Amino acid sequence: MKVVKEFSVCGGRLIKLSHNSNSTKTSMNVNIYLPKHYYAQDFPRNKRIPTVFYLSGLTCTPDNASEKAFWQFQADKYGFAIVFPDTSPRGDEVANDPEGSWDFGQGAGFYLNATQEPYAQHYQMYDYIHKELPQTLDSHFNKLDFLDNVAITGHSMGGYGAICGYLKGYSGKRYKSCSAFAPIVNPSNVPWGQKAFKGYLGEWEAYDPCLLIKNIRHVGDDRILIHVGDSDPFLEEHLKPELLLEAVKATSWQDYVEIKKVHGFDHSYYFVSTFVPEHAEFHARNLGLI
Amino acid sequence: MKVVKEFSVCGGRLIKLSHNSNSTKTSMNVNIYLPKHYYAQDFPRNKRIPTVFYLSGLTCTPDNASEKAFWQFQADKYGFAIVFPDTSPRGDEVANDPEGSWDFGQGAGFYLNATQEPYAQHYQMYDYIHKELPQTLDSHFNKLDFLDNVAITGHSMGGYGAICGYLKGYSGKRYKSCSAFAPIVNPSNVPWGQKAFKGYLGEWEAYDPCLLIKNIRHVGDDRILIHVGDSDPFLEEHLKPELLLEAVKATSWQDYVEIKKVHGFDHSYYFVSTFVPEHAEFHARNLGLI
Amino acid sequence: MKVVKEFSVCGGRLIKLSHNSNSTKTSMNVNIYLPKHYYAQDFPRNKRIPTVFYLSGLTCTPDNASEKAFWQFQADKYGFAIVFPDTSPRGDEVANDPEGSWDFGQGAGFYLNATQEPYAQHYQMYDYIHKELPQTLDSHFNKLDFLDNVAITGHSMGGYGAICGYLKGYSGKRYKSCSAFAPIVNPSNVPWGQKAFKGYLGEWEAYDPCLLIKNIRHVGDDRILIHVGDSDPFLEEHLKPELLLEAVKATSWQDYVEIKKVHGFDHSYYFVSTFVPEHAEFHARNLGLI
Amino acid sequence: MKVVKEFSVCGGRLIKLSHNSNSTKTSMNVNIYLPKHYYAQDFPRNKRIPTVFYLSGLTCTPDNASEKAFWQFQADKYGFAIVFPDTSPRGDEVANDPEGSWDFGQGAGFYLNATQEPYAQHYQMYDYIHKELPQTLDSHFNKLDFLDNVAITGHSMGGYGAICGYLKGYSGKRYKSCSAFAPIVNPSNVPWGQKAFKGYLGEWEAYDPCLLIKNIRHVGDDRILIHVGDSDPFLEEHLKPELLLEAVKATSWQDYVEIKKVHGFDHSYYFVSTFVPEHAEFHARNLGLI
């Protein structure tokens, strides 16, 4: 990892770094915000500032949410580090959408391990986020915990990637906490999902929450927090939370996935930054900061 | 005034508006956040809901600070509305820099009233901010107060245009409070101001805080709050706050103009957003909200 | 019709125009080259000057071909005016591809009269090129013949457009001659064609050269000239010219449709500009200029 | 040197090359057109296919002139190869205009050897075009002559380079012929030129044709051909050709600089392309091709 730029924000700082990925086969960009607890003064306690991984949506770069979500404030408030990875491989030699669409090429890896040859050469985004990046970061810094108690969250496609990595690593407690903002909950029946599935994979069960959640035994009081505005333009056609609610009905996860609607809200970061506080509090209590 | 878009944010709302400026002759875009206090239940003497005017710097649109400085949270915390105006005339039929610089022209009005024929045609940003815009808003919303007790704040070019329109209308108490983030405190002696002063104006006395303060009568406990980071790339050559600290030395205004350098911060909105809470509190106190 | 800009080229003029289209309900842009013969001096028979309509491909604007095809020179050499219309309706008011593809939507009308309700409102491009623009030009300029004996050509989407209009208006002698550069001939059974069809029309027999030509009685020694580089990146997937050939077999059109292979050529305008002189003479003979 | 793209144009081929320059310490892009005369037969003499170097103007890339001047047709007609170098260093580790203007830095090297430190590291464009590029080209291909029997020409900032380099290498017969399309002939006394000099050089003398020509003994029939439409928007303030005529009076060069005004022509490539056939004839003659 090499430091590309560091910005002082709130009590700590935002660091934008790059590294050659071995799963992406390309140079990848990642931003991380280190709280004021880092740079503190005590700590014989040791390496244990929790970490929240935030996956972004279609089109995004790590900078979008770094700049418009305002997680820094909450990171300083409860005591956690927050990582913003990119949305896909990116590059001149990277495959891209054959029609120039923004819902599928670079900037839209849908956090999957692509098997189709045009893409398989770089689109191993599931590995990158749940395996490589965590180890790559721990090896660059280690005061921080990027592998034990970490929480995962996201926005839209990024929200989908959150609920997905959480449910696939539940039996091993991979992520201690999971929340999402305007998540694509059932990609086998939504336009962008079916598209990415067809493009990156053949012809799906694995990778689709509404199907993966019926083969998973619930434990204790673990819940999934979801917020989604009713004035969101993509609600009706792309994000159909109600579906993940009927896939949870009469299942052990029943009543363990709350989908707070909330009136007048967008799909924009005016919507995300608004509920970030509540999500920061939700994750803090699951990471052990409150 | 017209409504382009209405987004719900925090407890209140953000409103995208366009209107036809007689001061610019051209159409103009403005953004405004109405607090959670508006939309509530009652409140009597409430008409005194102050309003903060935030001016932006070079190249900016009303959207930048609207999305990157999270004022809305502060707005709800103290109960004030905030307006984000544009930075220049803007349009196809409007003049622009002859060398295509982002320094001068559209997005670079420098909050002056243009005299030079080419620019004079539409560049009446001073009269636009301090005259037409306030009154146009009060006629569209009137409850809200864009005319009596209001504060003015800004970033860089806006920071200059903040300290300037405050000092000018000081005798008449046009603005109750005034702060700025990394402002251009003495345009004369600095390239950006020097260009805007030669291009929009001829050949300067007015429109220059370091000149205008030696002759203005300071009142009571009034002061100007300023923040600028010492890692600001433009500090040393485009915005030297220290020139105010000297121009204020030996004046009725000395000691009532404070500049806080703060180690490690940028000229970016990562810096602006870090000190928006302090500034918001500064205006809260002076606007009688607290 | 309004004059936007004029550039003297060769011995004549390139005139960039705009006009409010009734088939489009939007202001449309069109370029036209008036040859040395216009401006010349005498000869009573004025209307004589024929016209060539050059239809552009996906993504193009009238400026592309005007700048890189070098038609002006051939225009002056033979005495014809050449018209370059736009490729589709334009504006925010005008609908666009839902995924951002250059593939369909704006810059991609496919010279069709749409029926599917979202685009049907502006995308009446078939009528715009064959019905409205001609009359529009004739009314602005009249010396120049835009309706009687005229030729039509195109590149890729524009070659398809050229051949389709020539065939549909053939029994009525709508066009005296026709040719294409790397055209799409079988819109059905081809990705860009199929997508335009599904998107603009329902479910396409009409509008398809390979299905129409089977029901059009051939006359005299009329012929369609077609060039295409064997190194065209789209040849095998998007533009299978052999199909037109295979269609024409067992049809009275047999032997009257020649596709010249031409080794090493691209799909770019380096290819087009090379075979423009041969196409310009083809048209000259059929329009009676030589 | 390596090949990027390679397509067929007319009877020859255009070739886009890249190579690691030592004058620029950067990778530079270069386009070249090999006439049908290359790719033919034996020829004992052969090594006589001359070359013409076309320097471009402000903001240009080798692709502008390659796509809009049509030189390829002339090259095949007379039998010469033509090279289109780039206009500046190009790159993020390469300095640019501090105010983001388009008339200085990157796209605006002015074919000078920069001495001022920021730019001096990559702006050695004079040496690049007159010494590095030809030797590198000669080395990559060797039938072709890029060092001896060569002609130089240009457009605007390019015309100036063409004219300046021609005079400076006159004592050594550096170039056999020289012409220009709307050149800036007196860089001092003209805006873009003064900015170019002040930024790249200190204090100019040794790079101004109007000053250079007064100290070179004219030989034989040598002349300089220039074309510049009377409708060129920059004619009166940037390119004042009349000035080179005055510097030529009472000089041995008088009568050998012919400026053909040309009525109604723009500064655009519709202007350039129109008179390219005439300029090719001139150079061809001077290169012993006819």
From Swiss-Prot, chains A, B, C, D:
InterPro entries: AB_hydrolase_fold, Esterase-like, S-formylglutathione_hydrol
Temperature curve summary: Optimum temperature is 50 degrees Celsius.
pH dependence, entry free text: Optimum pH is 7.
EC number in record: 3.1.2.12
Gene Ontology CC: one annotated term: cytosol
TM stretches of this protein: none
Any one of the GO BP annotations: formaldehyde catabolic process
Catalytic residue positions: 156 (charge relay system), 232 (charge relay system), 267 (charge relay system)
Location in the cell: Cytoplasm
Catalytic reaction annotation: S-formylglutathione + H2O = formate + glutathione + H(+)
Cited SUPFAM superfamilies: alpha/beta-Hydrolases (SSF53474)
Record Gene3D superfamilies: alpha/beta hydrolase (3.40.50.1820)
A GO molecular function held by the record: carboxylic ester hydrolase activity
Keywords annotated in UniProt: Copper, Cytoplasm, Hydrolase, Metal-binding, Serine esterase
Subunit structure and binding partners: Monomer.
Known function: Serine hydrolase involved in the detoxification of formaldehyde.
Further remark: Present with 1750 molecules/cell in log phase SD medium.
Family from the record: Belongs to the esterase D family.
Protein name per the record: S-formylglutathione hydrolase
